[PDB]
Design a protein around this ligand. Structure first.
Ligand SMILES: [Cl-]
Ligand code: NI
Ligand code: NI
Lengths: 199, 199
């Protein structure tokens, strides 16, 4: 399959249609508030029928709340969840957790992302912005193949297809550019994850 | 005007009943993860029938996404929405936005919350931890009554009822403690918001 996680930022039925269409062709699907707002958490389980589901609600709550939230999501079928690294040291951990340490837009992460990255362990991997392949490459240098790296910020007006993967990422997260025409997934055909076969 | 926002961290039907019971007795209701997961976004409109709704999904996404999520929640009946200040300078703005700048648990905010507080303008208000009254008081020396302050972390395991209001908060946010026995709201009877009559 292609090293692409498709963000399903669209309506429930259309999201299911895309997941059905792309099952086995891509590495997974990203489910966010657009979908969860429509009918609730059940949508996670529907998409999870068709592939690995990363739930991305940018989780950033205190531990006893974050714990409950992650548990509900994984129980509904999520493979993993994206959480904010800024919570450190109150950071959800474990193999179901991806830790965001720099965003695609300017934030307080910018002054500290590499120190934060170096301090975090016992997680599935990290989210690094694919619109900054230099950041992805430096991250991979720091951590080697010890953890996954997944990267959004790929598509029009960010990193071109494969830019983050070439810089060291495992998977690129892409939304509208693929949703508007899923045939475009062929642009990732030449690429393979840097370190891990699955997200 | 009890200076209390009741967190409906519970199931949909129970949340409805509690809100009906407390209609006009409290300042508002906080709708979060648990309710949205169960009932989707429609729950916001249902609770709004009974009082002001603050939606707390700890929004922490890039500002185009965040601003659209805020607007969608407001359109469904929310008066305002809590977002993470860590995303500065890529933060949504305006009268529907409460900005969290320090949590009840240890996080990276703790080394910079006051600088962040002073950097953020043109929002509705700030969320500051009521289990740390000293932080609420220091925030007022910096911002005065220019913006609202609301505070969670109030309860048997946190700050005493009124502790945050006395330190300078406008409203305290309380969940389980009040849900267990709604008669407990009487503990807030002798308190009044420091700066703003409404959240
Ligand atoms: Cl991002
Ligand atoms: Ni995963
Ligand atoms: Ni409000």
């Amino acid at each position: 399959n292609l090293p692409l996680v498709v963000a399903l930022d669209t309506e429930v039925l259309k999201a299911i249609d895309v997941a059905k269409r792309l099952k086995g062709a891509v590495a997974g699907f990203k489910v966010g508030w657009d979908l969860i707002f429509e009918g609730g958490i059940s949508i996670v389980g529907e998409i999870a029928r068709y592939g690995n589901v990363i739930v991305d609600l940018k989780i950033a709550d205190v531990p006893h709340v974050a714990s409950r939230v992650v548990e509900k999501l994984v129980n509904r079928g999520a493979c993993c969840v994206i959480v904010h690294g800024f919570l450190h040291p109150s950071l959800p951990r474990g193999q179901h957790v991806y830790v965001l340490v720099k965003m695609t837009a300017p934030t307080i992460y910018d002054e500290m992302w590499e120190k934060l990255l170096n301090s975090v362990q016992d997680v599935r991997g990290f989210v690094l912005p694919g619109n900054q392949p230099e950041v992805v490459a430096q991250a991979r240098k720091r951590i080697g193949c010890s953890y996954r790296i997944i990267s959004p910020g790929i598509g029009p007006q960010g990193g071109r297809p494969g830019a983050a993967i070439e810089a060291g990422a495992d998977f690129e997260i892409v939304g509208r550019y693929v949703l508007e025409d899923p045939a475009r997934i062929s642009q990732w055909a030449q690429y393979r994850p840097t370190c891990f076969e699955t997200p």
